[PDB]
Amino acid sequence: YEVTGVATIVSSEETARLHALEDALFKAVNFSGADIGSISNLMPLLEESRNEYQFTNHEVRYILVESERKRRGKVEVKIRVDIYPSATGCHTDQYKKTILVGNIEVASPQQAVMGQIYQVGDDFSRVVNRQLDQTSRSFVSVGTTDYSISSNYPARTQMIAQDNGAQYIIGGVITDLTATVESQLLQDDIINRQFALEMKVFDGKTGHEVFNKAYREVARWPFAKTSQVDTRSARFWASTYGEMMLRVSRNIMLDLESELSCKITLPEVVAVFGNTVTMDLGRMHGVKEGDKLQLWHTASFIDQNGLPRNKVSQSEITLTVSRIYEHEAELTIDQPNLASSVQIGDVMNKIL
């Protein structure tokens, strides 16, 4: 395909070229309709600066870079790739997963003094929410929350997920915002600022921690030392630091696609009206009429030591979708005599 990759050089030409190649590959995969979950495993094998790349067992086979330019101080890379969009996979027949973006906090407010970027966590969780909402393939964002999610309180995680109707809750801590000064006699000072982050995803059905990853990137701080920067403004997010943080958010989305996309989606029972039950997933999540679903009885217990545990009882109950709304759906129980055993909170999975 014909794609362009744009990335600014911070300290190494190799890193900027690799970032531009990643951007071009991401655009090519998005246009080709291929899954973006598989991209996050291709990057490690892209550390080398070889003109030709060979891969096996992937939707992309050979990568050939034809043009590399450093116009306006940032590397531009033009490549041609062959993408094979597979019609099958463990991610195409699943309903969309609702995700709640939790509180992202700055561990050390001391590091945010330069620029007074103290609301960077909130304005970055907003970016992560919008990235998951309008860029992901298998995720739906149900908003942000002001509460902090911890692994010590699975019950609170379950309650907050129930309140917001979220299958997973994602929250992080920003651990490094410090900067160093590089000085040259010919020119002015260069301030390279750090952005480290540790993201954690919790399963709202049982309170377990299902995802855990750490990110660290560096970018130039173009603003003055004594200048105050607003994190909601376009001045912050159009700068080199802003571009780096946007790339970090994209990597978060790609990692979530890589890890959670092929987990089987489990819509929950919202209400039971005799022989008809209601599902928390609807038309906007990919539900189509005539779908057959299998019911699981949910029983998740905190064990004797306070650690969350999971236990599902298999059921002989199968349901079919009768009416579909934008955000909910109605299902009819195919075994009327077993309809009395369905309670609120039981989960279902689509029969393939």
Binding site: Y1, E2, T4, F31, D123, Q134, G242
Partner: peptide, 13 residues
Amino acid sequence: CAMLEPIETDEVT
């Protein structure tokens, strides 16, 4: 082929 380059809605800016 030839992938397009149309921009989309900004995430924050």
